[PDB]
Structures are given as structure tokens and as C-alpha cells.
Amino acid sequence: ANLRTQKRLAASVIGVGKRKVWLDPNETTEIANANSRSAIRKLYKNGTIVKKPETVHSRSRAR
Amino acid sequence: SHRKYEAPRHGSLGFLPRKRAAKQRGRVKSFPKDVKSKPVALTAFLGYKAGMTTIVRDLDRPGSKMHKREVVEAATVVDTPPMVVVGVVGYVETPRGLRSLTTVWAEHLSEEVRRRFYKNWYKSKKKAFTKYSGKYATDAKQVETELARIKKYASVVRVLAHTQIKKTPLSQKKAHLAEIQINGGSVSDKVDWAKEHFEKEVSVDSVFEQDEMIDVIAVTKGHGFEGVTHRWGTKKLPRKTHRGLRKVACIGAWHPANVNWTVARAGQNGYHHRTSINHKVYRVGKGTDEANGATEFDRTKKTINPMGGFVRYGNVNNDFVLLKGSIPGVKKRVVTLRKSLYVDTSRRAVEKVNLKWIDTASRFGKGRFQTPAEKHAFMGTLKKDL
Amino acid sequence: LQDVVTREYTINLHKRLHGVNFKKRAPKAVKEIKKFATLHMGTTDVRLDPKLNIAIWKRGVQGVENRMRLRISRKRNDEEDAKEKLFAYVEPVIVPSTKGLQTVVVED
Amino acid sequence: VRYAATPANPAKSASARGSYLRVSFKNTRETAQAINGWKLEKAQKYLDQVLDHQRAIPFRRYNSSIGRTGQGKEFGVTKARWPAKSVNFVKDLLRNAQANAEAKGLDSSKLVISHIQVNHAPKQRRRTYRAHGRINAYQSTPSHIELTLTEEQIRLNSRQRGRLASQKRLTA
RNA sequence: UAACGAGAUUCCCACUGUCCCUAUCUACUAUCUAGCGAAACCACAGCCAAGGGAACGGGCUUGGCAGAAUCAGCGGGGAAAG
RNA sequence: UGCUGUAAAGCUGGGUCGAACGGCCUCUAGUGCAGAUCUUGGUGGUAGUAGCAAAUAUUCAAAUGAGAACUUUGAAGACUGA
RNA sequence: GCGAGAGACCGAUAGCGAACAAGUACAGUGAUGGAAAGAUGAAAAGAACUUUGAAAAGAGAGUGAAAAAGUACGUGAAAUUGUUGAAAGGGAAGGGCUUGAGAUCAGACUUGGUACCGGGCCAG
Numbered sequence A: 001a002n003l004r005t006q007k008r009l010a011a012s013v014i015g016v017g018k019r020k021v022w023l024d025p026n027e028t029t030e031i032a033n034a035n036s037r038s039a040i041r042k043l044y045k046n047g048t049i050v051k052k053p054e055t056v057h058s059r060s061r062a063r
Numbered sequence B: 001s002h003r004k005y006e007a008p009r010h011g012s013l014g015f016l017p018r019k020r021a022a023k024q025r026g027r028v029k030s031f032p033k034d035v036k037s038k039p040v041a042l043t044a045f046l047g048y049k050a051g052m053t054t055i056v057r058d059l060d061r062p063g064s065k066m067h068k069r070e071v072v073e074a075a076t077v078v079d080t081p082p083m084v085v086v087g088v089v090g091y092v093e094t095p096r097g098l099r100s101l102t103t104v105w106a107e108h109l110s111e112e113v114r115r116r117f118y119k120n121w122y123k124s125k126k127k128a129f130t131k132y133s134g135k136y137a138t139d140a141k142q143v144e145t146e147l148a149r150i151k152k153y154a155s156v157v158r159v160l161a162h163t164q165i166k167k168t169p170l171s172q173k174k175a176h177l178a179e180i181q182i183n184g185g186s187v188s189d190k191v192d193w194a195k196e197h198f199e200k201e202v203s204v205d206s207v208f209e210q211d212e213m214i215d216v217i218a219v220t221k222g223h224g225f226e227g228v229t230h231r232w233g234t235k236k237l238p239r240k241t242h243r244g245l246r247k248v249a250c251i252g253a254w255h256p257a258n259v260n261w262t263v264a265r266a267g268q269n270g271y272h273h274r275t276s277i278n279h280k281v282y283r284v285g286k287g288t289d290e291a292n293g294a295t296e297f298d299r300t301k302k303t304i305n306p307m308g309g310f311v312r313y314g315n316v317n318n319d320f321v322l323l324k325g326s327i328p329g330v331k332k333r334v335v336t337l338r339k340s341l342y343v344d345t346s347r348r349a350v351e352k353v354n355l356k357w358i359d360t361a362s363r364f365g366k367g368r369f370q371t372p373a374e375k376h377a378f379m380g381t382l383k384k385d386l
Numbered sequence C: 001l002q003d004v005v006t007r008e009y010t011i012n013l014h015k016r017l018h019g020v021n022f023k024k025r026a027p028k029a030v031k032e033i034k035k036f037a038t039l040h041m042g043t044t045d046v047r048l049d050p051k052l053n054i055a056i057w058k059r060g061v062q063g064v065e066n067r068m069r070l071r072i073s074r075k076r077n078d079e080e081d082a083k084e085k086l087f088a089y090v091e092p093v094i095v096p097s098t099k100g101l102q103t104v105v106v107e108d
Numbered sequence D: 001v002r003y004a005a006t007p008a009n010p011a012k013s014a015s016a017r018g019s020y021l022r023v024s025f026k027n028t029r030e031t032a033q034a035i036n037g038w039k040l041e042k043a044q045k046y047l048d049q050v051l052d053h054q055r056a057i058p059f060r061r062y063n064s065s066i067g068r069t070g071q072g073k074e075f076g077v078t079k080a081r082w083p084a085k086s087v088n089f090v091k092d093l094l095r096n097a098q099a100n101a102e103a104k105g106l107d108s109s110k111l112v113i114s115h116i117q118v119n120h121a122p123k124q125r126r127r128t129y130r131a132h133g134r135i136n137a138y139q140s141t142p143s144h145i146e147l148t149l150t151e152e153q154i155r156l157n158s159r160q161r162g163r164l165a166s167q168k169r170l171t172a
Numbered sequence E: 001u002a003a004c005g006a007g008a009u010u011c012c013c014a015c016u017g018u019c020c021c022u023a024u025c026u027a028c029u030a031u032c033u034a035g036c037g038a039a040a041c042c043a044c045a046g047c048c049a050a051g052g053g054a055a056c057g058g059g060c061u062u063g064g065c066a067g068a069a070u071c072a073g074c075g076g077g078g079a080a081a082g
Numbered sequence F: 001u002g003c004u005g006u007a008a009a010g011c012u013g014g015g016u017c018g019a020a021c022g023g024c025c026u027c028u029a030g031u032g033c034a035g036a037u038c039u040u041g042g043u044g045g046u047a048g049u050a051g052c053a054a055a056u057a058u059u060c061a062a063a064u065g066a067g068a069a070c071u072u073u074g075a076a077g078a079c080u081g082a
Numbered sequence G: 001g002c003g004a005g006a007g008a009c010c011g012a013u014a015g016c017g018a019a020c021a022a023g024u025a026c027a028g029u030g031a032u033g034g035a036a037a038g039a040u041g042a043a044a045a046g047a048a049c050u051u052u053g054a055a056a057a058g059a060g061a062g063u064g065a066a067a068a069a070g071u072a073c074g075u076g077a078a079a080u081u082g083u084u085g086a087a088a089g090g091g092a093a094g095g096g097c098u099u100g101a102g103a104u105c106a107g108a109c110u111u112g113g114u115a116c117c118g119g120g121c122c123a124g
């Protein structure tokens, strides 16, 4: 119910900013149990945590 | 020391205090002085301000540069359905002023005037005047004794009358009830005329004729709290004035050590009671006339209402009075029309006006057509017309 | 009285947002829709679907559409000691034009 | 503990207290006076309507330069206000006193608020910073609240005696 | 004395709400509410006119008068505060 | 609650309270407060008043919880703009 | 400095600055500057248990000679404040003098003497 640490750990493990980390809204309890980086990796592999895609910056008008 | 230079006072000391009027309906302070030898008549009439328009006229003032020439003039429309007489009041002279002796009411009161006696009509049992009505049903002898009292003792007789507000487009359902003084004839004649008009309608054309000069009593447009610059027209202080410039810089000398009543101060502006005189009647139109807005020279089959309706009022579907110029009040405001308090013999008072044309283009914008038919003729067929 | 009922409405948000501070237009549209749902369903307990919130904010803080087609349903609220026996659920309606649409009872 | 007022019949009464409550003394005094001497149930209903801004608390002493409202017409005033925190503290104390009365067997619908008062509690100090490097006080003005619920010769001269004897002998 | 100057000054062109003469609009305040909550200052206090008086009184003398509780403003007075 | 004295003051009834204290003859002094912009501490009126307005901006739902404008998660709208 | 005995001395704003974890806490770059603060009760017997409350707490109960001693603790003044009762109130209030009204207080049937004697007070 306070997933601030899990968000920070996922950002570190996945290799993105915190702004690109998606924590499953429907899986709050299991994410709350993920205290180690190892558990964060497991949740990342299962898809419970997801890397959001980058916001497009197209160069088509520039070209 | 004296003022370095002279200037007239800002604002008039005769319209004080600049406070909110006590009632929204404007009251008639004074009625025309009674002349016994005239026919019995009403001296006032209540209507509703509908809006303004433009007319064209030929001027008849010899010696004027515009003599025998067309002039364009602003004019005001007052929606004036007939009033209903519902009662009579007798006043006796006393060394302390006029005192009302008794009030006599008609047998039946319409729902719109009986709504006037209620703050919460929908939650009430509607008992107003229900026991009074039984003073007629038995034999009306008590009513006639009261009227005999008025004949014996009163020196001033006024009728109680109300507007038929449901003939206007107003969403207000309460009628406006007022005392209108009866002038002419003896007191007995006044009481008889009041009695024969109980429950009856009296029309505007019986009080006011065309070319008459009449007075308007109404409460002005409200503006709320106002500063001295606009409330009193004082000079704006220079641009570089610390703490602001819409002020009166000196509000008094050291002595007297009190702010004087004559100094301009910030306060409530507008919503004042005003009695404006000498507004000429340009037309007394009729509600049944389907060419209210037509003249001898402009023969178009046309009502007084502008295309689209009067803005924020509606359509004038009753008898109306077209008055020269502007009158106090806003749209929808109940206005009291009064006969002149004096005899006027000047040209402007005795001129007979003959209207050439009355404008009926939209008041909601830059109206450029007088009629839907003219609009269609100018623009031709449109897509929505197929 | 049909306590449980679903109807579809048009709300004229343009006249309700007239003169409103530009950074409060979308937040005030939220408040206007809540007030609109109480005027028709008689319930102060009004819940807005998050898809409605997305539709309100689609064009930014001052980009609210002039008219929105809403589906409002009054529903029971067991939730004892709630002060409200019913509540109104407000959700958007995808339509090609939000013009010329009358209030319609929805047969679920 | 000693209450400022002791019930006439303690068997038909129930009290409650709150000390050192961090709620405005002035708002609490006005809210306590607004229900002083009322039936308990009437007072609870009224406080709930105050919280909903349907009725207001009349401010009669601590009211200088507060606003004016039409909800004061009920009480003959123009200055009234809706202090939620004071209302909540007073409601909690009324609830506690009702619980105490129920434990003593008293009937809730008969209970009237026969005593209620607010006293100053010691102030809590904070600090506020002023222009030109000055420090001023920023204190709280807390409250002591307490309340109680309660179930609802002519001897005569010689001449006077002689006069009455004579008058009695006259009328039989 | 060319050049230079946030230096002082006069006139001209352009320009304009500086002005004639003001009006209207926006945001934030003020305003009302929930919560929070200071300070300056304070003999006692607080309606006027005249008198006399430390020769310009809130109080004293003689008059005018005088009706609870108040809110937003205001800058005459408190020979206001610092 | 009263009594005595012109007075400075003295005595007494009732309540509160818990460990020492007074009359008389004398001795002695760091011995009597309204003021000193007195000292230290405490407390008011002011006053629920001034005010809590720079730095574009927040919204819906769920979770948690006695309690959520302010916590967490999701959706979104924004900004810093290397 | 070390060891003793005393006083017509002071009695917690006094007496050393300090009666207490006082040259402490804290301030200042530094030299230096430098407070406030003693007392439940004989004994913690420091309130078990029930109940309302999210809780702090309340209400019962309990201990105690006392809770009018509850670690906000000996007594517990004043300013200031709440409630209750009584009264007054047209641009201050307060004071003297006088009386009325309402409240309080007091006294001679005496330390009365033996139905009588005799006295006290207010009056004609």
C-alpha cells in the first residue's frame, strides 16, 4: 500500500526512469512483498512489472 | 486658504442619500391636484418597460432649422395591458396630514393579485380574502355601509388596481398592486365610479392620450458598490499616485474635525427612485392591431416588436405606450406612468406628432432587415429552404 | 418510482463553462457533470467513470467539448450507514455527432 | 475530578469531559452555548445539520468582523458560522455522555443538556517570523470541555386585630 | 576640441490615455467559508457648537441632543503610531 | 458573618487547608509601593482580526485506513526543456 | 588548598551565576557571554476490572486519612476566562451626600426576679 520503494527498485533493475515503470494495479499485495532486487527481477520477468514504451518524437516533419 | 481655482460641485445634494430604494415598485409621491369640474378619471397607470427603438418624424417647429424636416429619435416601449380595479380607499384631511379611513375590496380577486399577499404561495392554504368574500354573499350591506362612510368623510379617493402580469412574457406570477388617485367630480361620484369598476378592466387609452406629456416613476438600474470616480464624477488622480488614483484626495479640512455630508464617498450606485417628467406620448398602440408598428407612410403589416423579440424581455402583445426618449428603469421593470402636475403651453407640449416609420430590425445585433419577408426577398432562397 | 434506471442525456457544457478561468475549465466540467447527475437522478452520490474523465480532459485543461453525450444510471448502494440509498454512475457515450439528440430511456 | 456544576440528582445524570483539546476556545464556546439546555436528540440533529451547512451556529460574543448570513435569522442574529472542528469535538463528548447514561440505565429520549461549559486550556506555543528579523508568537488557544446530561405569616397588631374583629362582626 | 556619456539642459520630427475625459476587459487580492492565526498600540475613554481654560477640549460650563447588536469601505479627527 | 478604631489597622462567623504560630515588656533591621519608557514572571483588549495571493495546474478511479484535496498504484492533463 | 566549629545572616525573583545531570543547556569565527528549573503520598498503595471511543481520553469501579493529593501532582492569591444565580443598562463607566426598594445583619422580656413585680425598644 506504499509501493514507493518497489517503484525505485524497478526503475533501477529495468534500466529506465521511474517515469517508465508500470506496477500492476491489480497485484498490489505481491508487489508489496517484493522487497529485494531479486523479487523485482522475478516480477519483471512474469510481466507483473512492465517497461512502458518511450514517448515518440518523430523526425518526419523535420525530414 | 481658498481653493486656488473655482469649480462647480460634483453631483447634486438634492438626491441624497444615494441609497437603495425601499421598494422595487416606484411610488407616486404626489398626484395631480384635483379639479372638481372635470370628468371622473384615473391619474396614473402601471406598465412594464420592454425596450427602446428608433422612429422617424417630421418636425413642426417654425423657426427651427429642422422645421418641416425628418428627424430620427430614440423612443421607449412600455408594455401596458389593462389593469383590473379591485378596491377603493378613502382619505380624510387631518391636522397631521391625510389619513386613510377605510378600504373596500371587490368580491372576487384574481389569483395573480392574491399571489401578492404571500411569500410562499405554493405552501399556503390560499386563505387571503376568503372571509372577506362572505361580506358580499349574505347581502353586501356591510360593503355598502363602508362605501357610504367613504362618501360621507373622505376628501381624497384612490382606487386599488393591479396589473395583469400574466399577459406579459414575464416569469413573475405576482401582480403589481397600486393606489391610483381618482380626480374629477364629487367624492360621491368618485366612489360610484370606483364601485362600477370593481373587477373590471381599465385600459391605457382611457388614462393617456396621444401627444400627451406624462411622467414616469421607476427605480433605476442597479450598479452595486461604486467608487467616487464613477459614483460622483470626480477627477481621476494622476497616474503616479501611491495607493491608487480613483479617489477624492482631500475629504475635508482639519476643522470641522468630522467628515462632512457634502463630500463624495464610495457607496451604492443606482437602484434609486426617480420621478422623470415631460416624456411625450408618440403612440398608444393596441394589442389587437396587427400593424402596431406601421404608420401612414410605412404601410407594412408589422408589429411594434423587433425581429427576434425585445432582448431579455420578449414580445409586446398588449396595448403599449411609445414614449419619446429614455425613462428610468431597466427591461422588465414595473414603471408607473403619471399625468402631468401642471399645464404646459409650449410648442413641444402642444405639438401633434405624426410618425413616418418605426424601426423593427433586430436589437440582438446589426439588424439590417425590418421583416422576415424583406430578409427572404433580399437574400433569396437558402439551403435550409430547399 | 423506478429506483434503478438508466438514461442517456446531452449536457450543454458550453453554457455552463461561460467565462470560467481557463485553468479550471476541465475541473469545473467535472463539477458540472456531477451537478447535472444530481438534478436528474436526485442523488448526491455521483460516481464518474474514468473513461469520462479521459473524455473531459482529451483536449487539455480548457479543451472541453461544447456538448457531451452521457449515460447515467441510478443504482442501489447497500454499504450500510451511507446516507444515500442510491447512487448515479456517469459514463460517456461514443456518438458521431452530439447534435440533435434527445433524452432516451435505455432498455438494458 | 470536580465538575464546575454538580447535578441535583446524580442518579438521573451522566457527565463527560475533554481536557487539553486542540480546538479553538472561542468557536467551541459559541457551539457549546448553541445547544446549552437542549434535548440531546434535538441537539445531535442540529449539529449534523450544522456540519451540512443547512443551519448555523450563532456567534454572540466572539464575532467581531466575521461574516453575515441568512442562517442566523433563526436565532435573531446576523453573524453566524459553521465551525466543523468544534462541532465534531462536542458531538464526540455528547456521544460519550449518552453512552455513560445508557450504562446507568437512563432513557436517551428524556436526556436534556443540563450543563455544558468551555474553559481555557494552557496554550501551545509556536513561532512566526516577521519582517526585519523579528520573532512573534503563533499560539493555539485550546479548550477544556465538560457537560452533563439529565433526565427531564400574617401576624397582626392590637389595632389590626380589633379592626378585623369589628369588620367580621359587621358582615355577620 | 573629434569621439565617447544610465551626467545637467533647450528645441524639432515620430509617437503615444500624460492630458481633454474618461470607459471597458483579464489574472491575483480584497470579499464569504473550513482549518490556522500574529503585531503595533492601549491613563480612562470615545457625538457635536460656543465659552472659559497652559490663550485650538472626549471629559469642565451652557446649549444641540440621545435607542441594542452590527458588515464593507474610508482617510476629517484622535494636536493617531514609530 | 459581623464587631472595634478618625485612621494606619486589629478581632471574629463560614469555606479551603495541613504543621507550625501568636499576645505582652524590650532589642534589632536588607521593615510598608501605584507610578521610576522601573525589574522578572504572568495575563488581556486588539481578535477569531491582519492575514496564510510570486515560481502556468490539476482531474478520475482503485487500494490503504476510524478518518484521504494532500499517502500509494493505475489513467490522464501539464511543466522544467540539456 | 586541606580539616573543623559556628551566626540576632538568606530562605528558591532571596542566598554564590548555579539548593536540581550549572559554568550545564544555549549564543558567538573568536576573546568571551551564560540562563530557567526545589516540595504526590507515611507508603506507589502510580488506579486491577467493566464499559463508550480509531485513539488520546471519558464514565463506573479501585487505593489512600485525603484524589478538594492522579507523576499537568503541598498550599494554590491576582490579572484574565467559562458557567450558574441575581440586577442594571437612549453617545463611557466609575465617586460623594441622601432617602426609597430588595437582600443581609443585629438587638432585652435581661444570666430577668419571685400569676405578679420590674425592666428594654418605638411613639402620643
Ligand SMILES: CN[C@@H]1[C@@H](O)[C@@H](O[C@@H]2[C@@H](O)[C@H](O[C@H]3O[C@H]([C@@H](C)O)[C@@H](O)[C@H](O)[C@H]3N)[C@@H](N)C[C@H]2N)OC[C@]1(C)O
Binding pocket: G012, G037, G038, G039
Ligand atoms: C514535570 N514538569 C516539571 C515540574 O516538575 C515542575 O515542577 C513544578 C514544581 O516546581 C512546583 O513546586 C513548587 O513548589 C513551591 C510552590 C510555589 O508550589 C515552589 O516554591 C517550588 O519552587 C516548587 N518546588 C509544583 N507546584 C508544580 C510543578 N509542575 O518543574 C519544571 C517542569 C518542567 O515544569
